[PDB]
């Protein structure tokens, strides 16, 4: 049964099993129970077919014999649509189980007691510094006083911006099933388990696996953006909402342990969450002003609902009858004006007596939270509400105030100790999540603002903004930014795009400012791009204009950014507007699509240095907002070192980073990982501003510059100049099929990365590194040693290589070869072959530079997790390849096996969507 | 209370206590029991005094408040002779207990599961590569086949040469008490202990601690024969059994890399040797008779050890199935068999022929017994009627019947049984032979010159001593092919000359398997080596010992390459050495001449240069490592030290000194013994296939520049300051070490390296180890600020530099300039105090540059387990340093009076206290330079 499955799994991953290494055991137990379920639901025959696919794939992952892929292919292409769907569902579900098991292993893996002190320790969760160890290094090694460390942390802000799962927003219900599977699993391994508890936990585990597997409706319609946002907010309930105060309490403990005798102030804004879900409309016209309004109200509804749903518990605890005057007076006020009758609440449904004074205060907070929640709900569903302003909270201060009053009163009556329990936790939740637990960024591309302004200029009869030079655009924008009359009259002609863009500003002017964060400009190139958005916000008389944040994407745009920023910072109107602060966004995957990932990485390092210097010179504080695709978006320990690798002064007390949708599950799904994620963000941010990495040696810059010219040239000659690259890309990847659910340049970065990730080839991540390495080594043999010294000694270089190496570990060029054979026409097959030759050569240079014989010999726990997933992913790759063939070629047919599954009109496109989601869930983050 | 003692001890060593860290607990429990014993034996009052000394010292080691040293001084200087002795005995004893506890902690400390692969992992026992990990790295990272690894190990030799404890050879009896204390302690922490077992182990622990404490007789120095026998105790305690346990681990590791045979039982992978009774350099008590006696003692012990385990093997070898070959031999022995009682413990009647293996092994036992008794009669009576064919005279004769037993088992289907105790016994025989240590002789070059000068002058042909090096060579080569003997019966001989000649006579008379190398101390020249070769020829020694120069001073090291080249160019010599040469280096020796920094670097270069010269002449070179190097540290640091050696300087043959003050740590506890053998074997194997990086040219250049400056600073202080010697005699117990004995001392230059290192170790100042590093670092950094980074990169990246700094850093951690200051104040005359002060200023500056180069804020932040061990011993050593300081004042200064407390101890001068403090301080400091 179990032992035999353990046996097969163990062959896949040799390693040195101590007591805390249970990952293979976990996976065996889950696969075993899932196979019983499949047999039950679908029959022994189907179960055996799954087992056979698994076996062939595991054998292929052993020796990589192409024959095993062919057999696997023969089996899978012989299945009818019904059986295909069951098999893709099965293998997708096994990937999710394996991920949950891995999360449990990471959570309980033992910490290394004596850390070597090298920066490399910060790349691995077993060795990284926790917040206290970070405090102690800063005190003992950098000679900071405890007070200086405390004071910097109090002024620090970490902002985490959640973006949508590129493929599969996981619904709340299923998430909760996944959590209970993970728990049953952990409890099965609890010390001293009685046999009956074990028997019952076992049957509970079986049941939860099945419930999750059978949560599988294939819903005709794409998910609406409102549903995608709500799905994307599920992690707050599952872990983050409680996780924040647990981490802030660990900060209190750590402070205490370095001799600071106060708690971290409950209202220091150390942690802030934001979102792009319903705010980013770049290249996405489904994101309408109505969508943006709805996700603001949803965020407000959920936030007030989360406070409301925990206030009764706090009321129960706050039974104390000793209070100070201030609160006594307020309680007697509320008590006198108090309703004689039933409130339809679970717990305190009769009038609260005045000898329960804290309950009287908190009872009023509950009524306000309830009304705040209901208003938002009526605004969403009915389009408005008769609930008035003084019945709800419109600012966070109104909510904090009575809580602070409870706190002071307890402190004044001798009960400080009690105040620092749930009350303190609640205060911290209010201060972190406010009235909208995420602030929403708006994003739209620069050309849309140009178009809007052009419609205005031409209607005014003064010419065409689009025809104007950069100087003229600046001049006219600054004149109108101090203009005395509005720009927009009621008969301005508006195309649908122009209207859609203006109406977004209208929503911004109408909704409360605490709903919003930054206004990000995609494809920004110039000063005027930023002033353009400033003028539209001024025209709509927005009381608190959103800060305007350019996103410079292409290499050329990155090179022009410094002069653009310098010109902004020189303009009095703008300096006055921004009040000493500017945020700029970089997009790793964006820049990498333009120039190759190697050159984007190096150019982004340089551009950040240059912008930081320009900000200093102008006395402006700069925040760099990290978009997706960087070493800082990996999650887990690698994020810790990535943060510490940043160029000096680029953090300076304020971190803003994207948490990519495909990473959210690993970062925040399990509560220990959620805690350790918050911790490494806060610790690294703190450390970096007081302990910058080494700046590179001049020889290293020069070689980096030389390598970038070559990397870019290789990347661009393959991707942009080879006239048949596009055609090869459309055949070898599922790119076209993903898109229906101006070349690569007008293809967006997520489909670019995603399409090549699906085939296990990952061209967007590594292409260009090979030529860079080879050219450097061949120009001068000494460069091999220089590169190895950079890997060992230069944190930027180290993390940049490690991310590529992880992506190689998820790669398998045999999958791409099978796709070439099935999908690509014969005359392009040599092209596909030469790319595979570049992959191999590039991987081998990287290995040589890293000093590794094998992929990830640095990080065997990460390699182990990747290897355990591989057979499942491989089965899905093969299923997908033959599915694409059938879909593309209505005359491709094979003899079909009699239907295998029992029960007791889905098509090919349904099977495809299942493979694509499962493969993406197994690959998680790459480029 | 136990808990209160735990509390005090815990304050001394903050750290991050997981379950395997019990060292503080062990020390508390031992101190608590020893205190009960003191109260019992000597009264509550004396117990309270000891406690109070301990408390004051522990507080002082916490915050280093001078006030605590003063109070400790006031208390100790108020004690009479009788109480002083009890106190010094008490604190010495506690140091031994602490060392035993630390051993147990190192033995059970958890291994790190995932090693980073950096060479720095090989400096630490928790991270170093075991023999299998070593095999795997060679296979998977250096692309050796399993067969190539197996073949290199089969041809490898590791030879460990045991030297005398410089201060206190520990007697067998006490050693065994220490072992039992260590076991009681381990068993008290066994998982699932019943309360009665715990109560009984407790009482056993108490009893052993007392037995060891009361083994404390204080008149005569120990004879060199008794020192050798003391020095051999570790074979019985651990090494005898440890060797086959390690060789069986090699079998297991081989199997795990796909080699399906055992390591051959007769591959000479491990060899032990000795200097005890063989080294007479500066020591006229080591006579020819001494040397003869230690050879016979080694023979007696070895045959006794085989004898004392043969009956056990006979009992097991009950099997009745044997092959023809053994059957025939058994029936032979059975027919010629004695009808009557043998006075043995087990097989006292005639052995029947259906027990064939017993018949074979019965005859081996008789031979072993006779071999042992011959040696004993030769020692006690001066000769023996026991004839040659009644005993084993060659090891082959003992192997043969054991091999026959092995084959017969294999042939009858019992290979598996053969590979049990029989295999272990075969390995013991192959490793220890008929003399478990081979003895090196050592004598200084000038003695040979003196002997040959007597000969030339008696012959009327002039004076060898006056002759130039060229003329010496010419005459030596003529006589090395001479046709008549040199020495006539009327040669006039001074006692020294006679003593040196008669040593050669002992070498000619005894079996050659008793001996290893003839080491020449103070070697400088080709003729020095030929001189010894001529004397061996003159005595017609059938198997002459190989002649091994020890080049000591810097100038001698610089002249070594030309000396070796000349030797290797001479046909007579090439023919004599048959493709092999051994050369010795002495780290402490060279460091006394030129400062340790320059000696280290010069020794790196000289080894490189001699290796190259050997290759050119097609000679295999062995470098014999004398005391004081990073390779003499023991424990993990030894592993990285060995790997740090210049390329090709091991080449399959390691020969290193195991210093007497390190033997207890290396071999006393069976797990450490096993690990010691393992790291010597693993590192030696690895190095020949995986040399460290060779240094960058910039690094060599800076090393050269730094050496010039280091040597200059070391020599201006030690040799050019006209009052350094007078200061040294006041600030250290150097003179008293002399007049309470080897002999010890023409200034520092004629002072021997051990008394030099020892004297400054005693004051916790350690000048010999660090002096010169300071000027080297400062000059480098001030000449170019960039050198700081270069030096840090060398530390991080160049194993030689890393290990060289780590040893100095360990020594600073054992230092305390408060103790040296106290000695200055008590013992040094006022006009020399500024000198002492300026040395303390150099100490501080040198420490800080070292810390900066190593990237450490605090001493040993690299190695917290080592720091912890040193810190827990400090309070005991400090109490002894203070006691010693005031004792030396009283001994030296008839003016000094203090009011003495009424006698404290019950039951039921000064020189004795001093010897106790000197030995206890040395036992707590262990190895430094």
From Swiss-Prot, chain A:
Its cofactor is Mg(2+). Expressed in mesophyll cells, but not in bundle-sheath, roots, stems and flowers. It catalyses: oxaloacetate + phosphate = phosphoenolpyruvate + hydrogencarbonate. GO terms for cellular component: apoplast; chloroplast; cytosol. The modification Phosphoserine is found at residue 4. Pathway: Photosynthesis; C4 acid pathway. Belongs to the PEPCase type 1 family. The keyword Transcription regulation does not apply. Signal peptide: none annotated. This is C4 phosphoenolpyruvate carboxylase. It comes from Flaveria trinervia. The gene is PPCA. D-glucose 6-phosphate binds at residues 276, 443, 590, 628, 658, 748-750.
């Amino acid at each position: 049964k179990l032992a035999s499955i353990d046996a097969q799994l163990r062959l896949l991953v040799p390693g040195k099993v101590s007591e805390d290494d249970k990952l293979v055991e976990y996976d065996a137990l889950l696969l075993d129970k899932f196979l019983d379920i499949l047999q039950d639901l679908h029959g022994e025959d189907l179960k055996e077919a799954v087992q056979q696919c698994y076996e062939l794939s595991a054998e292929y992952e052993g020796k990589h014999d192409p024959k095993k892929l062919e057999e696997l292919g023969s089996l899978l292409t012989s299945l009818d649509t019904g059986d295909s769907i069951v098999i893709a569902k099965a293998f997708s579900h096994m990937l999710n189980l394996a991920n949950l098991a891995e999360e449990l292993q990471i959570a309980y893996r033992r910490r290394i007691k004596l850390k070597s002190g090298d920066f490399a320790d910060e790349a691995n969760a077993t060795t990284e510094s926790d917040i206290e160890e970070t405090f102690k290094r800063l005190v003992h090694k950098l000679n900071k006083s405890p007070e200086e460390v405390f004071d910097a942390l109090k002024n620090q802000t970490v902002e985490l911006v959640l973006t949508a799962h590129p493929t599969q927003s996981v619904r709340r219900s299923l998430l909760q099933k996944h959590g209970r599977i993970r728990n049953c699993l952990a409890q099965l391994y609890a010390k001293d388990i009685t046999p009956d508890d074990k028997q019952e936990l076992d049957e509970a585990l079986h049941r939860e696996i099945q419930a999750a597997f059978r949560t599988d409706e294939i819903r005709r319609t794409p998910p609406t953006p409102q549903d995608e946002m709500r799905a994307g907010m599920s992690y707050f309930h599952e872990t983050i909402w409680k996780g924040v105060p647990k981490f802030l309490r660990r900060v209190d403990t750590a402070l205490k342990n370095i001799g600071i005798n106060e708690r971290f102030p409950y209202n220091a804004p150390l942690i802030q969450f934001s979102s792009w879900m319903g705010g980013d409309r770049d290249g996405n016209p489904r994101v309408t002003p109505e969508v943006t309004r709805d996700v603001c109200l949803l965020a407000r509804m959920m936030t007030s609902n989360m406070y409301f749903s925990q206030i009764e518990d706090l009321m129960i605890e706050m039974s104390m009858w000793r209070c100070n005057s201030e609160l006594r007076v307020r309680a007697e006020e509320l008590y006198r004006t108090a309703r004689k009758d039933v409130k339809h609440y679970i717990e305190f449904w009769k009038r609260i007596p005045p000898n329960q004074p804290y309950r009287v205060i908190l009872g009023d907070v509950r009524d306000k939270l309830y009304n705040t929640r209901e208003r938002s709900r009526h605004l969403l569903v009915d389009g408005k509400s008769d609930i008035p302003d003084e019945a709800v909270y419109t600012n966070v201060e109104q909510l904090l105030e009575p809580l602070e009053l409870c706190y002071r009163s307890l402190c004044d009556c001798g009960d400080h100790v009690i105040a620092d329990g749930s009350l303190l936790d609640f205060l911290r939740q209010v201060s972190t999540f406010g009235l909208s637990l995420v602030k929403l960024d708006i994003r739209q591309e620069s050309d849309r603002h140009t178009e809007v302004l052009d419609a205005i200029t031409q209607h005014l009869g003064i010419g065409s903004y689009r025809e104007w030079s950069e100087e003229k655009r600046q001049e006219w924008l600054l004149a109108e930014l101090s203009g005395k009359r509005p720009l927009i009259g009621p008969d301005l002609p508006k195309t649908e795009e122009v209207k859609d863009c203006l109406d977004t500003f209208k929503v911004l002017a109408e909704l409360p400012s605490d709903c919003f964060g930054a206004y990000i400009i995609s494809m920004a190139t110039s000063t005027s791009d930023v002033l353009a958005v400033e003028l539209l916000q001024r025209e709509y008389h927005i009381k608190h204009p959103l800060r305007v944040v350019p996103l410079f994407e292409k290499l050329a745009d990155l090179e022009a950014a410094p002069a653009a920023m310098t010109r902004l910072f020189s303009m009095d109107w703008y300096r006055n507007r921004i009040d000493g602060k500017q945020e700029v966004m970089i997009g790793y995957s964006d820049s990498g699509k333009d120039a190759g990932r190697f050159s984007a990485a190096w150019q982004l390092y340089k551009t950040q240095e240059q912008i930081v210097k320009i900000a200093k010179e102008f006395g402006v504080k700069l925040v760099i907002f990290h978009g997706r695709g960087g070493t800082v978006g990996r999650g887990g320990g690698p994020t810790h070192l990535a943060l510490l690798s940043q160029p000096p002064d680029t953090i300076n007390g304020s971190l803003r980073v994207t948490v990519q949708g495909e990473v959210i599950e690993q970062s925040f799904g399990e509560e220990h990982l959620c805690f350790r994620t918050l911790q490494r963000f806060c610790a690294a941010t703190l450390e970096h501003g007081m302990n910058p990495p080494i700046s590179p040696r001049p020889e290293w810059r020069e070689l980096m510059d030389q390598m970038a010219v070559v990397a870019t040239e290789e990347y661009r000659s393959v991707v942009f100049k080879e006239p048949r690259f596009v055609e090869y890309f459309r055949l070898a990847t599922p790119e076209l099929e993903f898109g229906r659910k101006g070349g690569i340049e007008s293809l967006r970065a997520i489909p670019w990365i995603f399409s090549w990730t699906q085939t296990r080839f990952h061209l967007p991540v590594w292409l260009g590194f090979g030529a860079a390495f080879k050219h450097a080594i061949q120009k001068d043999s000494k460069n091999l040693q220089m590169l190895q010294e950079m890997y060992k000694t230069w944190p930027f270089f180290r993390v940049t290589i490690d991310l590529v190496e992880m992506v190689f570990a998820k790669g398998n060029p045999g999958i791409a070869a099978l796709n070439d054979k099935l999908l690509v026409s014969e005359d392009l097959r040599p092209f596909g072959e030469s790319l595979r030759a570049n992959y191999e050569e590039t991987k081998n240079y990287l290995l040589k530079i890293a000093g590794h014989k094998d992929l990830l010999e640095g990080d065997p726990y990460l390699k182990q997790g990747i290897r355990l997933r591989d057979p499942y992913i491989t089965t899905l790759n093969v299923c997908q390849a033959y599915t694409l063939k059938r879909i593309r070629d209505p005359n491709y047919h094979v003899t079909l096996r009699p239907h295998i599954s029992k029960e007791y009109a889905p098509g090919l496109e349904d099977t495809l969507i299942l493979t694509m989601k499962g493969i993406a869930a197994g690959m998680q983050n790459t480029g």
